[PDB]
Write a protein that binds this ligand. Structure first.
Ligand SMILES: O=C(O)c1ccc(/N=C/c2c(-c3c(Cl)cccc3C(F)(F)F)noc2-c2cc[nH]c2)cc1
Ligand SMILES: CC(C)CCC[C@@H](C)[C@H]1CC[C@H]2[C@@H]3CC=C4C[C@@H](O)CC[C@]4(C)[C@H]3CC[C@]12C
Length: 241
């Protein structure tokens, strides 16, 4: 079988082994919705407690994306500088895409600490506009009904982007990007799903939402810093130190 068919299978496998939550569990858990009393309990928590809970959930989600990246064929053969450039620019963009699997467009809820709740759950953070933008982005993606394999291949391409400023081996990243682009396009053709290509987000949209999100995380980290065991210490030290 072709190099390309093996690449499709290796990306989909890496995604399945690092997807964090199973699509089947997320879909079954949709009727499990926070009560009005439970929502008020979250809204009454301090900004610093809600920050600690959200920062830790986001850090864990990032570490699943680092492991995904480390299993992509060719990623570990890039020099360490380029691994960090791609993960710094891309890992949180991948988390914001992965969110659509945990999002219910019928009631605008996300899976958070065991149940589905609306953006009002997060009232204590004082970030309603940013959180509203994140919910709207997931709402956009949800209308594609991405397959597990589509989201594996799309998120691989979010990370493997030869236009990220600061790459030292831009040609080696182009070669991996071209192969992943061919794998995605090959797979959409094979499954009669080329129709999603015209519906994917404007590329600057993900970058611009993500830059606002990370800027806000960096401000909270500065006021009330959390600490975690780095999966990728060189990357951690770039973001945290
Ligand atoms: O090695 C590891 O395990 C590891 C774990 C997490 C890392 N960064 C996470 C963050 C955060 C963030 C979060 Cl999630 C919570 C609190 C504070 C921050 C802060 F802003 F301070 F960085 N924000 O953006 C990213 C990011 C990562 C890649 N691109 C953007 C980096 C390495
Ligand atoms: C701006 C900062 C301070 C607050 C952000 C609040 C909201 C939007 C955050 C807090 C915790 C986050 C979740 C943490 C973990 C996961 C699992 C991952 O597989 C998909 C994304 C998902 C489901 C995140 C979606 C966004 C999320 C719900």
């Amino acid at each position: 079988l072709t190099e390309i068919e093996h690449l499709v299978q290796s990306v989909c496998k890496s995604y399945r082994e690092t997807c964090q939550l199973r699509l089947e569990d997320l879909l079954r858990q949709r009727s499990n919705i926070f009560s009005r009393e439970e929502v008020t309990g979250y809204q009454r928590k301090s900004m610093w407690e809600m920050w600690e809970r959200c920062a830790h959930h986001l850090t864990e989600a990032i570490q699943y994306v680092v492991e995904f990246a480390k299993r992509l064929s060719g990623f570990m053969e890039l020099c360490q500088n380029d691994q960090i450039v791609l993960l710094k620019a891309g890992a949180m963009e991948v988390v914001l895409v992965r969110m659509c699997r945990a999002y219910n467009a019928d009631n605008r809820t996300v899976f958070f600490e065991g149940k589905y709740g609306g953006m009002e759950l997060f009232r204590a953070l004082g970030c309603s506009e940013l959180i509203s933008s994140i919910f709207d982005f997931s709402h956009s993606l949800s209308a594609l009904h991405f397959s597990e394999d589509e989201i594996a291949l799309y998120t691989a391409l979010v990370l493997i982007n030869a236009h990220r400023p600061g790459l030292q081996e831009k040609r080696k990243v182009e070669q991996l990007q071209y192969n992943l682009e061919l794998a995605f396009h090959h797979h959409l053709h094979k499954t009669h799903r080329q129709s999603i290509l015209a519906k994917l987000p404007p590329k600057g949209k993900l970058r611009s939402l993500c830059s606002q999100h990370v800027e806000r995380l960096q401000i909270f980290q500065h006021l009330h810093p959390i600490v975690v065991q780095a999966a990728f210490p060189p990357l951690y030290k770039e973001l945290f130190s």
